Symmetry: C3
Subunit: 136 residues, 3 copies
């Protein structure tokens, strides 16, 4: 199911030195996000670094949100995951998309400029209207 | 998109010493959940503690669920995340909402009473009816 | 809400030595997935192992995806979570479902054959059609 989402490019490397995000296939659930870096960042075991994407989105529809997830292989094989574990992007967030990258393993890992380092999915969300009860 | 959800308050501090959960804005995807504690809890690196919220919900609609996520800043900047990483709340769960708080970093952190320590989103869910095949 | 999903069994132990996945109740959001193992696997603190399920699904609908999550108790009480934290299954994935199991705690844990070790939810997903703007 498709939804138009505004995207703003913040760094001129985007598109020029690595591509914009695209779905691998029409059956893909997520979009891979790439590290927008002047220089490679070497992450020792246990450390966290904030990696820019050079991108901002504005979802705008309050019935939609995005969730940022680790990449499967990076996480399983290399211990490279997200420092906030899963990163929620609200419909009114219009700042740069930033990736909290955490090395949860025992091996150092260097993030190269342009490397795919997380994925993003778009999911419908609901806002609860709470009904206060004193017994269910 | 809005959905009525029953909520029961379990601890008289809720509302009295810190507020009920509310959406920051009409475009917010998540609700911040606060620690309902008699005393602050100091979490050393690597440890996990179970924090009550003083709240129970009963979603009741089987086409909806809630997911509990870390807060972005706490997770990235402070290494304070969830011990179960993401916590799924089923439509028929009517117990207290409990937060597994894990210090995944290298600095001790004290959870103050009333402090926002996780977020909750409501998402539609589907139940699979499996169709057994012996080749796709 | 129900959706037909094709499932293929890859290992003859499935159904014979432990059951196929089922929803506990009609209000359950997730399905527990079991370890399909010839022998128990003992996971020391910090290590990760790739556990087969003996199962493959083919969601096929591009408006649906699955997310693999830790079990709540395993994660909170035992530090047994997913090495990729959350595992996304695309609508066109038709390989075996594999579970990255990570011991994020301080106690060794042995995964027994047939033991429930993760959960899977099915959620609607949206594919973004990006609209390039140079200011929001």
């Amino acid at each position: 199911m498709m939804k138009k989402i505004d995207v703003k490019i913040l760094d001129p490397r985007v598109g020029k030195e690595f591509p914009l995000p695209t779905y691998a296939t029409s059956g893909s659930a997520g979009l891979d996000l790439r590290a927008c870096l002047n220089d490679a960042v070497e992450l020792a075991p246990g450390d966290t670094t904030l990696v820019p994407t050079g991108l901002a989105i504005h979802i705008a529809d309050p019935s939609l949100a995005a969730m940022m997830l680790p990449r499967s292989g990076l996480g399983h094989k290399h211990g490279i995951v997200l420092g906030n574990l899963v990163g929620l992007i609200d419909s009114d967030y219009q700042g740069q998309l930033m990736i909290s990258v955490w090395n949860r393993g025992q091996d150092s890992f260097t993030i190269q400029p342009g490397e795919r380092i997380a994925q993003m999915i778009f999911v419908p969300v609901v806002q609860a209207e709470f009904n206060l009860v004193e017994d269910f």
